[PDB]
Amino acid sequence: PFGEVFNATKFPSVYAWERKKISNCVADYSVLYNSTFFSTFKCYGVSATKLNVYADSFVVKGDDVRQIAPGQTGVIADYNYKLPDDFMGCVLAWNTRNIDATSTGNYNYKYRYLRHGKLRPFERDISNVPFSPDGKPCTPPALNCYWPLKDYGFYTTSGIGYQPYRVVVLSFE
């Protein structure tokens, strides 16, 4: 039931990433071994088989993919999706310019740029409350009040590190 994750017509935004539970299954993984159609494939664990899982789907900017790994710096890894320090399986990613990007500009995809504190590993946040750097309610127009969720803006002409990349994170337990 993997080809049902990478191959899903649509993918979520990082701030609202999708977890799919996979149990009582058998998969060969070789559907994943046999791929040049794949730009990133770091597996912080192994690369063998036990014919036995959690897939995390979402989209990011090229240069944002480097944060889907442990110990990573910020913004995406900080306020969206924080991978656990040791605890790990695989991180898979692939360029999608023709799919999630358009010459006219495509902004469906969101990400949280502001927040009060880092997410714990696998934490989530769907919240949408006007943010202020010293707590306090917010009501923009008002100043120093911003909306946490900003749009990516995926143009088909942009640099690689600015093109959409669909990313799937497999975890084991």
């Binding site: 010293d134 120093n144 803006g153 143009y155 002409t157 942009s158 640099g159 690689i160 590190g161 600015y162």
Partner: protein, 597 residues
């Protein structure tokens, strides 16, 4: 949170938003300059208005941040770069008039066309019509024609507008706490708070004029020599002691003496450093030229062009049908999207240009690391200079061979070398006076030391006096010759070309020193020199984040610019000139003219 802390979040919000508008603005601007359709001219404006409107919104909003109450240089820079007022400081009636001027002028210039007095059917547009004449005609009168018609038609026209352009633009500047628009422009070079790295808007003029004095000796000879040469070209039309006729300088203004080469070449029997023909004889296309320059940068350690570059850039005029503007430009649209727009002719002049253009693009790439508000050359001069450093290494006979445009056998001797040096002077040394002179007249016509009724009288004084150029016909105050050049009538700072040319050789010195190079600076080719490549990058990636004085000290070791290096690159040609001129008058008389005869 603190005040500095509040600022951090503001700028972050700015970046993410600006990048989205700035890009759509650039993508619009592009689609227009490469395809002049009507639906295109529309959106070019819209996005470019939303951008400029959002910038204003943001500027007044940044205004609410005390940068004095901020102690993190990085942030202070961008915040205050945003604490800008632009022309928004004028009234509505002015700020529209001004834009209408700036537009009318820009138009007139690009749409100007002269028609044959004794044939009102055919007309020529500056490019490629007049330009070709100015670059090729050996006919005194044909060149007199072009030169005079252009300034007579499209010139007499820009005259009123320019006078008003001067007013409204002065106001704009003064209201922003500047002396004049001149002061505004000289602003670019300013730096406050660092100690020894500070630079004032006045200290430019002082340095420029000073540095320039030390160039006079070398230029007077160049002059003296090309004069003699031109006397043979245009027998009887020139005075052994008089200035050079403006219409005989190889292009429409004499901005560059480059086209004089063919008839001022020291040793014609040598095998031509103008590989123009070699290129033609070898079927080189625009593709080869650019793929060729990319390889150059690669060799010094820099990256290929982004595959995007190759899919998006416009390297050859689409011809007619789909028409586009041709000025060679290097685009940093944003979102890591790079490209060049150039109607590449297979000239050598264009192969060198390819490099200078691609130079910019490499610099654009190198500082895409920086926050949006810091992505830019250390100052206006830096970017042009980077382009030129490339343009320099590539044009050496050495490099020429490496490429394949010059016989593997080529025997570099003192005659070829003078040829190569004489050429390099016609372009480099030639502009120096022209450019300084231009900007002076302009600077003066801002502090208003020049009244409307002498505007031309004085310009031509400075051509005769500073450049040793004279106009072939008299010009009354109806005329506005300075605006005949794009940069003026299209509102562009110009001293950059001068400052640029100095840095050029400064960088080149230290880059070749870094590349463990043999002897004469002019012979240096930094190709294949990762060491040298690496060095440049380290100052390239600093964007505007650094005061140009510091960044320039990082590479060459100098708080300021210096004319010394340039002078050495040209010493051989200086001493060889000195001799040649032994049977010539060197210098000129502001008194001789082809019309007052």
């Amino acid at each position: 949170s603190t005040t500095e802390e509040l600022a951090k979040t503001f700028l972050e919000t700015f970046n993410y938003e600006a990048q989205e508008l700035s890009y759509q603005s650039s993508v619009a601007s592009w689609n227009y300059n490469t395809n002049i359709t009507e639906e295109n001219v529309q959106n070019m404006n819209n996005a470019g208005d939303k951008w400029s409107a959002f910038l204003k919104e943001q500027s007044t909003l940044a205004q609410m941040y005390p940068l004095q109450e901020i102690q993190n240089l990085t942030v202070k820079l961008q915040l205050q770069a945003l604490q800008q007022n632009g022309s928004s400081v004028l009234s509505e009636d002015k700020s529209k008039r001004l834009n209408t001027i700036l537009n009318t002028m820009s138009t007139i210039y690009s749409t100007g066309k002269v028609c044959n007095p004794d044939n009102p059917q055919e007309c020529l547009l500056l490019e490629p019509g007049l330009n070709e004449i100015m670059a090729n005609s050996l006919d005194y009168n044909e060149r007199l024609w072009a030169w005079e018609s252009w300034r007579s038609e499209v010139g007499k026209q820009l005259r009123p507008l320019y006078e008003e352009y001067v007013v409204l633009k002065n106001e704009m500047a003064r209201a922003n706490h500047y002396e004049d628009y001149g002061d505004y422009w000289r602003g670019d070079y300013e730096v406050n708070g660092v100690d020894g790295y500070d630079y004032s808007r006045g200290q430019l003029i002082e340095d420029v004029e000073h540095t320039f004095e030390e160039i006079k000796p070398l230029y007077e000879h160049l002059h003296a020599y090309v004069r003699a040469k031109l006397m043979n070209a245009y027998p009887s039309y020139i005075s052994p002691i008089g200035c050079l006729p403006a219409h005989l300088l190889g292009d429409m203004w004499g901005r560059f003496w480059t086209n004089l080469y063919s008839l001022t070449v020291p040793f014609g029997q040598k095998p031509n450093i103008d590989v123009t023909d070699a290129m033609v004889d070898q079927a080189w296309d625009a593709q080869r030229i650019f793929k060729e320059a990319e390889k150059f940068f690669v060799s010094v350690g820099l990256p290929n062009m982004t595959q995007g570059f190759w899919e998006n850039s416009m390297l050859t005029d689409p011809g007619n049908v789909q028409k586009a503007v041709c000025h060679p430009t290097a685009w940093d649209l944003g979102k890591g999207d790079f490209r060049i727009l150039m109607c590449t002719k297979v000239t050598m002049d264009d192969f060198l240009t390819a490099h200078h253009e691609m130079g910019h693009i490499q610099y654009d790439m190198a500082y895409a690391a920086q926050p949006f508000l810091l992505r830019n050359g250390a100052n206006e001069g830096f970017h042009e200079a980077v382009g030129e450093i490339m343009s320099l290494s590539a044009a050496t006979p050495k490099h020429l061979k490496s490429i394949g445009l010059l016989s593997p056998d080529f025997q570099e001797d003192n005659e070829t070398e003078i040829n190569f040096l004489l050429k390099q002077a016609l372009t480099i040394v030639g502009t120096l006076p022209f450019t300084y002179m231009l900007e002076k007249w302009r600077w003066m016509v801002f502090k208003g030391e020049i009244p409307k009724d002498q505007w031309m009288k004085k310009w031509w004084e400075m051509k005769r006096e500073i450049v040793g150029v004279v106009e072939p016909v008299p010009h009354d105050e109806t005329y506005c010759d300075p605006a005949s050049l794009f940069h003026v009538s299209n509102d562009y700072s110009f001293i950059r070309y001068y400052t640029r040319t100095l840095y050029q050789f400064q960088f080149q010195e230290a880059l070749c020193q870094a590349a463990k190079h043999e002897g004469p600076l002019h012979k240096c080719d930094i190709s294949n020199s990762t060491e040298a490549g690496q060095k440049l990058f380290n100052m390239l990636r600093l964007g505007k984040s650094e005061p140009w004085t510091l960044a320039l000290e990082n590479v060459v070791g100098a708080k300021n610019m210096n004319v010394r290096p340039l002078l050495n690159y040209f010493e051989p040609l200086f001493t060889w000139l000195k001799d040649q001129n032994k049977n010539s008058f060197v210098g000129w008389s502001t008194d001789w003219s082809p019309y007052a005869d």
